[PDB]
Amino acid sequence: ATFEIVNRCSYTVWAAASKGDAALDAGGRQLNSGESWTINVEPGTNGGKIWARTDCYFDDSGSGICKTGDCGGLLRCKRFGRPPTTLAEFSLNQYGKDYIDISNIKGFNVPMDFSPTTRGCRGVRCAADIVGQCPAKLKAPGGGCNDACTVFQTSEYCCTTGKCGPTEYSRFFKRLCPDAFSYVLDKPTTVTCPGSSNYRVTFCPT
Template identity: 40%
Template sequence: MNYTHRRILLTVLLLISSGAKWSEGARVFTLVNECKTTIWPAITPGENFNGGGLALRSGQSVVFTAPVGWSGRIWGRTGCNFDQAGNGSCQTGACGTALKCSASGEPPATLAEFTLAAMDFYDVSLVDGFNLPITVMPVNGKGGNCSAAGCNTDLRNSCPTELAVMADGKTVACRSACDVFDTDQYCCRGVYGNPVTCQPTYYSKKFKQACPTAYSYAYDDPTSIFTCLEGDYIITFCAIGRKQTVCTYHNHRLVCSGSSGSASLIYKWLVLMLLCMVSLWSCV
């Protein structure tokens, strides 16, 4: 059983054991690009996310809504060049030649993964390698852990040479040890296909040290999967060493990360107007 199938099974078991019931409702996803360059977020399944892909300029944000029952992944693509028809290529994270993804991205890519239910489950995974820092910040949650997950360290700067993906003399991504060496030990398969025999390796320990709240290898469950009851999610690319407040708008109410109370009315309207001006979100 591979990592993706195992994670789905784990999520289902957690749902059953928690007694959570599927409920009506939706979750607001705010994608924020704090990288210095344009990135191309990809989402599968993408029916509720601009068809699965878009361009997001530096400093720009975009808001989507996904229904309860959606289960999928979000990642960033870099170094892309698409024509007006949405055909092109990317240095990292490509899903074939399409702007709007209908399939998973090519490793290495940092993945934000979600299963939306009455109790949501989410994580950020480096099991398929790393190409961009990603953090997931829940807001508006009514219970559960609702902790921040992800990696706000740029592993490209410390990637071991044997894992590095190079382009134009720069490290543009960091592959997983499984992808590079393709052994049962690194890939947690065969006799290593269980949490007892598949233990952290030299490479997964380096990933975990840099990104304590991200999956570093397939059985890194206890410190890497999080829950939140009816929360909304702010996914930030390249929030390196930053703890700035990011806001999203839901149910006619502005909610900000890192804020325990309500903002003043003037502050709410200022942030909301800024969101409308700098994002792809239509506010009318």
Template identity: 40%
Template sequence: MGRVFLFLIIISFVAFSFLSEVQSTSFKIVNKCHHTIWPGLLSGATSPPLPTTGFALRSGKSKTIKIPKSWSGRLWARTLCGLGSDGMFSCVTADCGSGKVECAGGGAKPPATLAELTLNGADGLDFYDVSLVDGYNLPMLIVAKGGTRGGCSPTGCLVELNGACPKDLRVARVNGTRESVACRSACEAFGDPRYCCSEAYSTPDTCGPSVYSQFFKFACPRAYSYAYDDKTSTYTCASANYLIIFCPLPYTSQKVLGARKDGAPLPLVNKTMMYL
């Protein structure tokens, strides 16, 4: 009797493990930048934990992570990272403040280009976007692969914006050249409620695009440029795996993008912006 009970426990465990694997989603994170990046991941308050919250990814390399099906959270890339004289790990852009390579529950310090995903949400759809609401530090592309429903359209910001960033928003690395390494949001730069969509400007009716958010929107038509930029910035797909590329080529091949299912009129990149 005891052996039968033990056998049933083992079978149940194997079945549960198989079911969990089937119900998981994969994120393949690819580094097309010419330098090492340190991706960071932050789970939502009610989301299950991930197998990693931060790691190094060398140029040309990729890493695939299994994500629980009901997960919601953010993903970004840190740049110009290393150990300080105090032995603490930190990054010039998008640091998560943990003092380690793993972010361990820390979010990206603005400015940072963010991938935001909610898996298996309303009607079983995944909701995903690339947000520049907290500023920008790297180009990013999200491609949904193998989806069964929803538009499943690629989205992102494929343009290098640090060089073209308005002077008031630039974040410079003091290294003799004062090279711009990130581009702040107007909210972070000025703290004005009009730019932050806060206080008297906390509704879609009172908070609209600004000249600063329009800089981001012009360059990257599908990315979130301010808090209420939902209509042209949120995409859906069901039962997909996701390819997340940092520093993708501006004219990414159709082989990577796949056939668009939503007929979205917005381009992935404003070609005029490429020459700024």
């Protein structure tokens, strides 16, 4: 499957793509404002994610640090990033269907649109100003708006027992971005697309 990752933000981001135990394609790249990066994701990839990282410094070896979404200090991510990270999530070719969603379960850093470029399903977006409106206790100093599980590490926020409900914090994300997951047991906002669809992830869509 082809993903085109587009940075419409006014600032540089460092895109990342991983399935948690390996890079997808090159795993990461710098995207200046307006740049597009096209990756190939193997059919049948389960549990892939794409995100943006902000305020990164990397050396010639591709080693460094980012203020949001750092993936163990590497330009080319093999593992998932440190919250807060708005996530584009996908599982491809699962019994004939692709499944896509946006998630705020690991917080929010950059607004995102995640849309197919082929026919047969709708996209999803979270483009509200979550950082500007972020509750004081969830604001991340490096930028972004953390989820409550990351900040407080309770069973209720992290849904550790597999029973949890919505919270004051999850409802904040849900109010601003209804089409994104706000907590682990949120009513799913997953979209089902035809198997082998292609997609575009746009940072700062509006």
